[PDB]
Write a protein that binds this DNA or RNA. Structure first.
Ligand SMILES: [K+]
Ligand SMILES: [Mg+2]
Ligand SMILES: [Mg+2]
Ligand SMILES: [Mg+2]
Lengths: 224, 290, 51, 105, 88, 260
RNA sequence: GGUUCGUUCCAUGGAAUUAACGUAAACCCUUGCUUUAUUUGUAAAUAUUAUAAAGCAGUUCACCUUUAUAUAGGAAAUGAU
């Protein structure tokens, strides 16, 4: 028994009895702690009582002696199957960074998926395609594939314009005397040079080191 | 000569540039359009919320439990399900337990109680100190020395105390009582990481002191009196809880002091100070007779 | 504080460091202040006089 | 924190108090690690520009200065007599010499 | 093939010799000298260049000790997390 | 998300009496600015610039060759409002200090009047005409005129997109062409390599845009029309603009040192 | 777990916080230096051996290296002293 008897839930019951009477028989009990009356009407909650957890999926009806009746179940939605299909068809869509840090939690209040892929507050990513697909598939009664094609093609027409802006925006700026810094292609190559040079130092050092091992195999200390 | 002389000009031009840069920053900084700033990292300290909703708790990652493997089945009552390999704490259970603790921190402060906010983690110092300022309580952001409650006579020996009246203004004449009086103990502890410091929570249960803790999925819920199922590993969820509890104490101290101005004291002299009064009359009686 | 040590530092209030030349000629010959010639005045600024 | 700073090389050298001095003046046992981070704040606040530095930080920074002066013991130089003879003294384990060195042959 | 097991609860998760044990280099030069005498001979000329290297080794100053390895400190931080726990 | 903000003195509902009818100011700011913000919001919908100010985006995305398109909207939404804000409801008398200082840098108010107006028409393209405040570490507060193209930032921190000279009709084989060409290459090479061409004081205090003039097509193409036969047009637009300059505010934003 | 001549110091532990003795410090002799005193000691002397009261001094400064960034260590006739 490595545990200890924690009586944190009975601090009131214990303190209420110790303050009811006085140790010195024949005198009135002294004033109780200042906290005894503050939580007089705020009892603790019931702890350590395993309930039947919420079932997020229909439990196996064929099981006659089911186990894990007090185990929280996995939360699975209809979108999980769509996210896996999309991101697998567009693996490099994961390279596009996406922030999962919420600002105030009120993001699903301005999302009306009957308008289109572009919504307020969230970026155009594989989720917008999934939420748009789920809407058409349910409301418009489209099949998984039909809704997928429609919502998928709207995603491309919006991404194409994004890549065209970067090219034209730069070309347009130089036509009026606008210069920029080092592009990502150049910066990436310079970093490889600094690393390749460090590898060259490691190669020449080990190569020379192996020569000693090859010469140390045979013995020539006599100097014939 | 001309090289080091340049620094003399720059070092001397910083005041001018700073003033001019500060003025210019007030002219064209906000001209384009209005930004709908709806989240600032240091917002739970500059102006914490009075009450936390489900959106605030979710945005603060107050529902991220620990890995399913590392769980305490005792606290399977606050878990909503399983996702990303972790247990998801119910957003409704976290709010109902948080609103209850706020009612506890408020009343204890309304009855002149001594609260203690304990958060001992690398970045939990600004949070606990800010909560204490609002609730006029004590803070603790380092390892709790074992025995500071059960062995307070020794540990808190030379620490000074003071006697205050209804309106928190000090009273004169208790000089002899502040030398024999034994050290104080918190009337309520608010731990932001109960899993770490169980020596503190045990002294509270051993000394009959109520406690409030943030019970993560792997924490034993039987260590405190009032649990707050939430993610204690997140620095953003702890600042929100502390702010709520901090505001609760503030709102409690306001009522207590506002009632004192009307001659309505919400508390009576503690037993320790009460005994000193009786002895005072006994010694004073001798002066009357003799 | 009882067990804390002491850092070795010069005490310029000591009568030995105050006047490094103990000869009354140099001390009283208007070294820094003027018209402090009277030996009594110099002693009053160093010892607590009861009279 | 928004006030400008000064490069490290341009900050006047200051003799900050040591861990022992704080323990003695405060009558506490402050952890070396906790004090190491408190001292960094002193060095950071000291980087503020003097003209822009407020009066509050100045007073707070004056309590951390170490006013310790080591004892000075300067040896006296060996003089040379009017005739040009210097007297050097040397000892070895029982004895003491006195050499009068002059220009000669 | 199975994967590495989860170690049982130990008193301390550490390595006996944190920093490698340095071998005296001159001991290797002596072995080469003893090899010449075995094959060439003692009062020979083939061991001249090898005997000189042995004299130069003992004359040279030994290296300085390396800074101790801090592996055992980090092992103690993740013990309860990596293993089943701490036992005592 | 970035949202539109009301104008200075209710120009949206009423508009300037003798400069821009309410219908023109409606299409110039309430409709166009809304269009730019709708595009800007979609670009910074999930980036760090989701809560940053237009000016903060202008300086942050000035040199980035991959965020040039984000700079245009951010720089356009800023310069557009910077122009309408300075417009006054009624004519304002030029301040004594400002009037006296302008004569020292341009000789007379009429000289600066025809310069900015002339520079606008001489550009034959959308952009902005600025009245900049040049103050070097030791030199007095000297004013000058700078003409930016479609979306150019007069701030020193955004020197990467100043866009002063057109690279189509300013770089050729003539003596002036070669000179301009060398500068175009000297800037690009230096900017790319990171070298600083002209030193600048910290905090971007060298240049402080005081006044602006939006010469884009949408601003005046409706009120003053094309301008065939000299009646109206871009020229009249610039001229009429000279009668609604809030010289009081222009003087305040100048922050001229006391030299009188 | 590190470090130290050292339960020294730092960090840390789901228990520590502290007191006394030994230890350490300090003490006596000795070493360099400053001031004091000059007989019965010192050739002379403008004070330098000796005598002996008090005070200062070290691993201090410089150089090199340095873990968890918290505590430091090394080099020993060709840095100072
Ligand atoms: K002597
Ligand atoms: Mg946790
Ligand atoms: Mg200990
Ligand atoms: Mg001893």
């Amino acid at each position: 028994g490595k545990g200890r008897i924690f009586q944190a839930a009975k601090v009131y019951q214990r303190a209420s009895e110790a303050a009811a009477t006085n140790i010195v028989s024949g005198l009135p009990p002294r004033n109780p702690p200042l906290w005894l009356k503050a939580i007089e009407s705020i009892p603790p909650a019931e702890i350590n009582t395993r309930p039947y957890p919420i079932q997020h999926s229909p439990p196996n009806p064929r099981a006659r002696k089911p186990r894990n009746l007090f185990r929280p179940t996995k939360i699975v939605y209809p979108e999980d199957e769509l996210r896996r299909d999309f991101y697998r068809d567009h693996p490099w869509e994961l390279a596009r960074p996406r922030m999962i840090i919420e600002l105030d939690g009120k993001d699903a209040r301005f999302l009306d998926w009957s308008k289109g892929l572009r919504q307020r507050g969230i970026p155009l990513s594989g989720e917008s395609v999934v939420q748009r697909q789920l809407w058409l598939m349910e409301n418009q009664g489209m099949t998984k594939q039909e809704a997928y094609d429609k919502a998928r093609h709207e995603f491309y027409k919006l991404r194409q314009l994004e890549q065209m802006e970067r090219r034209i925006a730069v070309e347009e700026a130089r036509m009026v005397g606008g210069y920029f810094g080092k592009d990502l292609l150049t910066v990436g190559m310079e970093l490889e040079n600094k690393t390749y040079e460090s590898w060259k130092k490691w190669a020449t050092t080990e190569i020379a080191r192996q020569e000693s091992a090859r010469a140390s195999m045979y013995t020539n200390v006599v100097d014939n | 000569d001309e090289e080091a002389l340049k620094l003399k000009q720059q070092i001397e031009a910083i005041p001018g540039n700073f003033k001019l840069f500060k003025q210019t920053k007030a002219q064209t900084q906000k001209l384009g359009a209005g930004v709908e700033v709806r989240y600032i990292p240091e917002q739970y300290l500059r102006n914490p919320p009075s009450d936390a909703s489900l959106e605030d708790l979710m945005a603060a990652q107050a529902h991220m439990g620990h890995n399913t493997s590392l769980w305490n089945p005792a606290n399977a009552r606050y878990i909503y399900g399983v996702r990303q390999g972790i247990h998801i704490i119910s957003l409704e259970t976290t709010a109902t337990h948080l609103r209850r603790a706020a009612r506890v921190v408020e009343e204890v402060a309304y009855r002149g109680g001594l609260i203690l906010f304990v958060g001992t983690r690398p970045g939990q110092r600004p949070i606990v100190v800010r909560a204490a300022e609002l609730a006029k309580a004590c803070h603790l952001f380092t390892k709790w020395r074992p025995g500071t409650i059960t062995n307070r006579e020794q540990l808190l020996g030379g620490v000074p105390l003071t006697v205050v009246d209804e309106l928190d203004r000090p009273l004169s004449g208790f000089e002899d009582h502040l030398h024999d009086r034994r050290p104080l103990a918190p009337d309520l502890v608010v731990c932001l990481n109960p899993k770490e410091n169980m020596t503190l929570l045990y002294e509270c249960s051993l000394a009959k002191i109520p406690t409030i803790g943030i019970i993560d999925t792997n924490t034993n819920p039987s260590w405190v009196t009032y649990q707050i199922p939430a993610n204690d590993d997140s620095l953003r969820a702890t600042a929100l809880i502390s702010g709520v509890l901090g505001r609760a104490g503030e709102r409690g101290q306001k009522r207590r002091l506002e009632a004192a101005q009307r001659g309505v004291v919400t508390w009576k002299t503690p037993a320790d100070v009460q005994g000193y009064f009786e002895l005072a009359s006994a010694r004073a009686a001798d002066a009357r007779r003799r | 504080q009882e067990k804390a040590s002491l850092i070795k530092s010069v005490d310029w209030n000591l009568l030995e460091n105050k006047f490094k030349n103990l000869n009354l000629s140099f001390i009283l010959n208007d070294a820094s202040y003027a018209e402090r010639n009277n030996l009594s005045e110099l002693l009053n600024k160093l010892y607590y006089n009861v009279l | 924190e928004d006030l400008p700073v000064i490069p490290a090389t341009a900050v006047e050298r200051v003799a900050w108090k040591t861990l022992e001095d704080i323990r003695k003046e405060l009558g506490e046992q402050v952890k070396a690690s906790e004090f190491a981070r408190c001292l960094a704040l002193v060095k950071r606040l000291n980087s503020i520009h003097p003209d822009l530095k407020p009066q509050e930080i100045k007073d707070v920074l004056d309590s951390f200065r170490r006013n310790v002066q080591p004892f000075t013991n300067v040896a006296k130089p060996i003089p040379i007599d009017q005739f040009g003879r210097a007297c050097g003294v040397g000892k070895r384990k029982a004895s003491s010499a006195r050499a009068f060195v002059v220009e000669g042959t | 093939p199975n994967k590495p097991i989860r170690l049982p609860p130990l008193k301390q998760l550490r390595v006996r010799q944190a920093n490698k044990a340095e071998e005296n280099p001159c001991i290797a030069v002596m072995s080469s000298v003893l090899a010449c005498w075995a094959s060439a001979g003692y009062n020979s000329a083939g061991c001249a260049t090898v005997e000189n290297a042995l004299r130069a080794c003992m004359d040279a100053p030994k290296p300085a000790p390396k800074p101790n390895n801090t592996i055992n400190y980090h092992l103690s931080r993740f013990q309860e997390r990596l293993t089943q726990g701490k036992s005592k | 998300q970035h949202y539109l903000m009301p104008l200075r003195d209710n120009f949206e509902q009423e508009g300037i009496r003798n400069f821009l009818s309410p219908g023109s100011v409606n299409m110039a700011y309430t409709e166009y600015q809304t269009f730019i913000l709708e595009k800007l919001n979609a670009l910074v919908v999930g980036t760090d610039f989701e809560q940053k100010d237009t000016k903060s985006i202008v300086l942050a995305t000035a040199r980035d060759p991959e965020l040039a398109h984000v700079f245009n909207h951010a720089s356009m939404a800023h310069n557009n409002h910077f122009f309408f804000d300075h417009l006054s409801p009624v004519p304002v008398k030029m301040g004594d200090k400002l009037f006296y200082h302008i004569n020292e840098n341009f000789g007379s108010v009429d000289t600066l009047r025809d310069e900015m107006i002339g520079t606008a028409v001489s550009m034959f393209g959308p952009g902005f005409v600025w009245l900049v405040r040049t103050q070097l570490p030791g030199q007095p507060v000297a004013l000058r005129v700078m003409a930016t193209y479609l979306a150019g930032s007069p701030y020193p921190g955004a020197h990467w997109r100043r866009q002063e000279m057109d690279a189509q009709t300013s770089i050729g084989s003539s003596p002036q062409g070669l000179s301009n060409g060398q500068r175009f290459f000297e800037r690009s090479a230096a900017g790319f390599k990171g070298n600083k061409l002209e030193p600048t004081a910290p905090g971007g205090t060298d240049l402080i845009p005081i006044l602006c003039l939006n010469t884009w097509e949408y601003a005046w193409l409706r009120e003053y029309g094309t301008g065939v036969g000299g009646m109206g047009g871009k020229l009249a637009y610039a001229q009429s603009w000279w009668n609604m300059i809030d010289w009081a505010k222009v003087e305040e934003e100048a922050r001229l040192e006391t030299r009188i």
